[PDB]
Write a protein that binds this ligand. Structure first.
Ligand code: HEM
Ligand SMILES: CC[C@H]1OC(=O)[C@H](C)C(=O)[C@@H](C)[C@@H](O[C@H]2O[C@@H](C)C[C@@H](N(C)C)[C@H]2O)[C@@H](C)C[C@@H](C)C(=O)/C=C/[C@H]1C
Length: 396
């Protein structure tokens, strides 16, 4: 089916503000064939109700064996993860790490996350001119530092994830993203082998042991896929929640003032950051196992479907006055972390990081503000991730 719109042709204007386009589409129907800025042809599902339903609908699979579109060699190497599986494989894989990310288990990481944030912020505050780029100084370093310590990724090996992730989000090429994947995949395999038999206590070491104890519970391919998903799934997302959220807060002085006046509104503010400018613009690939009809529009089986969480969050019927960033707004039911069996397992960790980061910036940066007109900001064209290239800020 030919695309009705080529998102790439819309340019940076769409990347910066995609909402009007999604809403115009929603006004004419729930499903639309489009071409992403990358060149991929997929279906977009818009509207909160339809989005929510599709996310949990078992008729839409995440197993590539149900996609008419073949996986590339590199992707086929990291495909065996819970997010790209259906029950029972998904059920088995998720159980292996579910207990690791509960709210109570994550709470024990507060002291260390707080140290990391205080460290990064104080380093940022060393700027002789009271200016810095929040992405480079805090948004990017925080999540990678936290997850690497949890998984056991050596400090020296983290710089490479900077370049690799930039390739995944913001290429320069189709090809390039694949190259980055092959590189990272190769690295993960070597990191896993370096753990085997070393008696480490980090999560990756424990997973390696789990795989060695029972290859049926976690195969070599699934072990590699687990390392991949735990590193990727929470990196780019958390990074952009922090940057996007602060951008939202700093571009709405009234909300900043409100949070300043009552820090107990912090948790609600982070939830509205997810609703208003969540990092996941469109969910990961879903494939109908059978032809599915959405309000008259039939999506053929095997086709690629992207649920546009960004649009669901701007649906008036569900979030009144959607264009307004209101930190005290009712956010119950948002889909920023997904919905259904694939609901984010790292949500408590992401919230811990964001809440601690947001508070530190507000309590230690006197007169914190954006140091650039918003029209000068550059947003990623990637269909799944909503994010900035940089976020220049200033303080007294
Ligand atoms: C602000 C940060 C985060 C956001 C907005 C986010 C969002 C999401 C979303 C939308 C999904 C579902 C995607 C879909 O259904 O297509 C998901 C799945 C997942 N996320 Fe997160 N995530 C974040 C942080 C994390 C962190 C910190 C971890 C690390 C533990 C993580 C690990 C995962 C995993 C493993 C899954 C797969 C769940 C499954 O398939 O059962 N996420 N996340
Ligand atoms: C928590 C949701 C994150 O998504 C994922 O973890 C999934 C499993 C993932 O890693 C893929 C969606 C990647 O997206 C793309 O990767 C390219 C190299 C190939 C491309 N292909 C389908 C055309 C597509 O799979 C992931 C590396 C994407 C980047 C931008 C990312 O970090 C997003 C993460 C969340 C959406």
């Amino acid at each position: 089916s030919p695309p009705v719109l080529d998102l790439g042709a819309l340019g940076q204007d769409f990347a910066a503000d995609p909402y009007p386009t999604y809403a115009r589409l929603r006004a004419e129907g729930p499903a639309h064939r489009v071409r992403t800025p990358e060149g991929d042809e997929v279906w977009l599902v818009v509207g909160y109700d339809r989005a929510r339903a599709v996310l949990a609908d078992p008729r839409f699979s995440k197993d590539w064996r149900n996609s008419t579109t073949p996986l590339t060699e590199a992707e086929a190497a990291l495909n065996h993860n819970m997010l790209e599986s259906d029950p029972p494989r998904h059920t088995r894989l998720r159980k292996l790490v579910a207990r690791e990310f509960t709210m109570r288990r994550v709470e024990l990481l507060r002291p260390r996350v707080q140290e990391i944030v205080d460290g990064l912020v104080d380093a940022m505050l060393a700027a002789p001119d009271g200016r810095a780029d929040l992405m480079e100084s805090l948004a990017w370093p925080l999540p990678i530092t936290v997850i690497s310590e949890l998984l056991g990724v050596p400090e020296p090996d983290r710089a490479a994830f900077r370049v690799w992730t930039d390739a995944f989000v913001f290429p320069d090429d189709p090809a390039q993203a694949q190259t980055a994947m092959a590189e990272m995949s190769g690295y993960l395999s070597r990191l896993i082998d370096s753990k085997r038999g070393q008696d480490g206590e980090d999560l990756l070491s424990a997973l390696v042991r789990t795989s060695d104890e029972d290859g049926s519970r976690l195969t070599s391919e699934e072990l590699l896929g687990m390392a991949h998903i735990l590193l990727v799934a929470g990196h780019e997302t958390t990074v952009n929640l922090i940057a996007n959220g602060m951008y939202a807060l700093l571009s709405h002085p009234d909300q900043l003032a409100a949070l300043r006046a009552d820090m107990t509104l912090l948790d609600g503010a982070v939830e509205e950051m997810l609703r208003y400018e969540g990092p996941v613009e469109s969910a990961t690939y879903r494939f109908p196992v059978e032809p599915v009809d959405l309000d008259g529009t039939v999506i053929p089986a095997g086709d690629t479907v992207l649920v546009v969480l960004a649009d669901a969050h701007r649906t008036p019927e569900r979030f009144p006055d959607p264009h307004r960033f209101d930190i005290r707004r009712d956010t119950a039911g948002h889909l920023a972390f997904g919905h259904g069996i694939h609901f984010c397992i790292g949500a408590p960790l992401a919230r811990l990081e964001a809440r601690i980061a947001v508070r530190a910036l507000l309590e230690r940066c006197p007169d914190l503000a954006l140091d650039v007109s918003p029209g000068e900001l550059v947003w990623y064209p990637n269909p799944m991730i909503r994010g900035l290239k940089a976020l220049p800020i200033r303080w007294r």
